[PDB]
Amino acid sequence: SGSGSELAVDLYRNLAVTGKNLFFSPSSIETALSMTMSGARNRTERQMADVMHVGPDAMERHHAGLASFEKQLESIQKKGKVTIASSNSIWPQKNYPLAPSWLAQLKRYYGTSVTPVDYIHETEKARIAINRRVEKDTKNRIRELLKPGILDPLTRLALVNAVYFKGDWEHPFNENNTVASPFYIRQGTTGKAPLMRQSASFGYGDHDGVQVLELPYAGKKLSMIVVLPKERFGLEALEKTLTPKQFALWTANLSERKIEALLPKFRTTSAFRLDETLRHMGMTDAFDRNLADFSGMVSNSDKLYIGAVVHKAFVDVGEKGTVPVFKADHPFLFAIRENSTGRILFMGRISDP
Numbered sequence: 001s002g003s004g005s006e007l008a009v010d011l012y013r014n015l016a017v018t019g020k021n022l023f024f025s026p027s028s029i030e031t032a033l034s035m036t037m038s039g040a041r042n043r044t045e046r047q048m049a050d051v052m053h054v055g056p057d058a059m060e061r062h063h064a065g066l067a068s069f070e071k072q073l074e075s076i077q078k079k080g081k082v083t084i085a086s087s088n089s090i091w092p093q094k095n096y097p098l099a100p101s102w103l104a105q106l107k108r109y110y111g112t113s114v115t116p117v118d119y120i121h122e123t124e125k126a127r128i129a130i131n132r133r134v135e136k137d138t139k140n141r142i143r144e145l146l147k148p149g150i151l152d153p154l155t156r157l158a159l160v161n162a163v164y165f166k167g168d169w170e171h172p173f174n175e176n177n178t179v180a181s182p183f184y185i186r187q188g189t190t191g192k193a194p195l196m197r198q199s200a201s202f203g204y205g206d207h208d209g210v211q212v213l214e215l216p217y218a219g220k221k222l223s224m225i226v227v228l229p230k231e232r233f234g235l236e237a238l239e240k241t242l243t244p245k246q247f248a249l250w251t252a253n254l255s256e257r258k259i260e261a262l263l264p265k266f267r268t269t270s271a272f273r274l275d276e277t278l279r280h281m282g283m284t285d286a287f288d289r290n291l292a293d294f295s296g297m298v299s300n301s302d303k304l305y306i307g308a309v310v311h312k313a314f315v316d317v318g319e320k321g322t323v324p325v326f327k328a329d330h331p332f333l334f335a336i337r338e339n340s341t342g343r344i345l346f347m348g349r350i351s352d353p
């Protein structure tokens with residue numbers, strides 16, 4: 001229940017691996033797929049629409065909603081209390097005439113820069129061109145995103161997106177309260193993480209098998225949602241049951257309450273070639289040269305198909321900012337949510353900080 005939340009949960013369940021951290025942006029993936037879907041036709045388009053849960057007649061509404069979300073993100077970055085270093089771009093093969101209607105559709109709903117590159121003859125300089133745009137967009141935070149081997153002379157279309165995030169809390173942790181503590185990874189394996197501690201008014205929900213804690217970032221326009229299994233190693237069973245409605249229930253029961261919160265500080269990164277994942281989720285024609293219908297992209301019978309989808313996300317969680325116990329010292333799920341729309345900017349899991 002909520003825009004983009006169904007794709008976010010689907011993505012989460014396809015990307016979470018046991019014993020392994022996770023951090024990704026469902027909204028940036030969705031934006032990249034939606035920019036591409038606007039040029040898809042016939043069965044290619046319907047598969048992508050099904051994957052993103054866009055009902056029929058609802059396509060334009062879907063793009064507009066992502067456009068207005070992007071404007072809300074820009075408005076939040078301007079307050080200076082969070083960092084969202086983002087890059088989201090699409091890279092067609094050079095010298096394929098592109099349809100004006102697609103580019104118009106791209107400018108009115110995304111305002112993105114499409115710079116074609118010659119994969120056939122200049123694969124390596126295409127790799128360098130793509131890596132340099134990402135470095136420029138992310139203020140040098142995401143460097144040499146594409147390694148040699150992703151692109152080849154048979155690539156015709158690449159979706160590249162990356163995001164760096166960190167934010168100031170509304171309620172800062174005092175560093176003098178942070179203590180390196182055991183972090184239980186699995187039954188017989190215990191690690192170490194610095195546990196930040198404070199007692200403050202947080203969004204809080206009690207449920208059958210989890211506690212849920214909402215920690216707002218400064219300004220209260222974004223919030224971190226931490227879903228903490230009550231059983232020490234209960235995350236996996238919880239992820240198995242995870243549905244969009246369940247996640248909506250966890251985020252709809254968040255009234256303010258003073259909570260003694262213990263949250264590890266951590267940095268974590270995920271980098272994904274998402275092609276196979278997206279095939280599993282039902283987006284198959286788009287990656288098949290013999291089947292993809294991207295005729296909405298071209299004006300002169302050229303054949304585009306998705307050859308690579310690359311996503312990298314980085315998060316930094318620390319103390320900086322300005323009763324029940326919530327002690328996140330065992331594997332948990334978390335998400336960063338935009339509070340005006342409810343949209344999920346990031347999801348992740350911490351199994352081994």
Ligand SMILES: [Zn+2]
Pocket residue numbers: 006007010051053
């Ligand atoms: Zn679904």
Ligand SMILES: [Zn+2]
Pocket residue numbers: 006053
């Ligand atoms: Zn569904």
Ligand SMILES: [Zn+2]
Pocket residue numbers: 171200201202203256
């Ligand atoms: Zn508060």
Ligand SMILES: [Zn+2]
Pocket residue numbers: 276280
């Ligand atoms: Zn597979």
